[PDB]
């Protein structure tokens, strides 16, 4: 392992300006010391990459169970909040704490995604209660609100030109213009069909040096946990048009994340049973894999960046997928040089 979290950990993101790890989480069982945080980690090469606790930030009885990065500041789900966080290096860390709104109110709220547009000048949430809700940053003055879903909110997405997507347990697809619905995604509609499925994750990637370049990627899961589950399937779509370019089934192991590198070239997965993989995003081939790397639920993954400090610590070696889980630990994972 790279680094083992005094609590489970629930999310990850690789600033490539200051080169840092944020590994996020909480719920872990200690007498005194940390239950629930934010550690920042510096990664410096040694003799091999390696990974060292430069600030933990305290989230109280707060389990941050989702992150989402922009230049220097980071929105952090807690709880049935979205919280601010502001950090800066000098090796010291100082981390200040901005504004948090509360995102979901369902009886039993939670959020479960977040993430900024391009210009890191609004922030889209969603949660349990299947309302999009979208935030001026830093202010987080509330400018959309509307009904995305019928059930919880699993994923969503900003991409190029404005566009949103989600997914739910209702097992809709949506693409959204402000509040305004574009077109459904209609993959998930034969007679003895053992269960229908529900989109898990999506992603916008833009590959680099091709002309029909820009992608949103899906992964589509069983609905219904069965006996002999059928497989989880990863699907590629054109960005703009949103027509199905190519879908690869990605084992019997329920997915449980999705990540796209900075360059759009590469994906990552997470499974339940602590498998990783990572594929070539353009054809969805598989270049690695490995069956429960972790014991238990990978609950995020991300890749190092391919600009900033990142490939200086990269080397020799084609990219680089850092995952986490549930086990507190987070993982390297390196392709081949060449």
Not at 184 to 204: G, I, K, N, V
Not at 305 to 327: I, N
Request: charged share 20%; aromatic share 8%; glycine share 8%.
């Amino acid at each position: 392992e790279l680094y083992r979290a005094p609590f489970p950990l629930y999310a990850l993101q690789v600033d490539p300006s200051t080169g840092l790890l944020i590994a996020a989480g909480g719920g872990g069982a200690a007498k005194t010391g940390i239950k629930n945080g934010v550690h920042f980690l510096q990664l410096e090469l040694i003799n091999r990459l390696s990974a060292s606790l430069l600030h933990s930030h305290d989230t109280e009885t707060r389990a941050t169970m989702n992150l989402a990065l922009a230049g220097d500041i980071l929105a952090a789900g807690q709880d049935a909040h979205c919280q601010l966080l502001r950090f800066q290096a000098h090796l010291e860390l100082r981390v200040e704490n901005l504004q948090a709104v509360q995102t979901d109110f369902s009886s039993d709220p939670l959020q479960k995604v977040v993430c900024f547009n391009h210009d890191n000048t609004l922030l889209a949430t969603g949660g349990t209660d299947g309302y999009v809700r979208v935030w001026k940053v830093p202010s987080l003055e509330k400018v959309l609100e509307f009904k995305a879903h019928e059930g919880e909110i699993e994923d969503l997405a900003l991409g190029p030109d404005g566009k949103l997507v989600t997914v739910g347990r209702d097992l809709k697809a949506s693409v959204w213009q402000k509040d305004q619905l574009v077109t459904q995604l209609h993959w998930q509609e034969p007679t003895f069909s053992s269960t229908p499925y529900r989109y898990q994750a999506c992603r916008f990637g833009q590959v680099p040096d091709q002309p029909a370049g820009l992608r949103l990627f899906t992964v589509q899961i069983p609905h219904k946990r069965l006996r002999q589950p059928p497989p989880c399937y990863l699907t590629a779509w054109d960005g703009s048009n949103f027509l199905p370019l190519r879908t690869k089934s990605c084992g019997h192991e329920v997915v449980s994340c999705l990540d796209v590198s900075e360059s759009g070239t590469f994906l990552g997965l997470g499974t339940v049973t602590g498998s990783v993989a990572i594929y070539i995003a353009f054809s969805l081939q598989c270049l690695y894999y490995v069956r429960e790397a972790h014991g238990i639920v990978v609950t995020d993954v991300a890749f190092l960046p391919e600009k900033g400090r990142g490939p200086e610590l990269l080397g020799s070696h084609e990219t680089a997928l850092f995952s986490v889980a549930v086990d507190s630990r987070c993982q390297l994972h390196l392709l081949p040089s060449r």
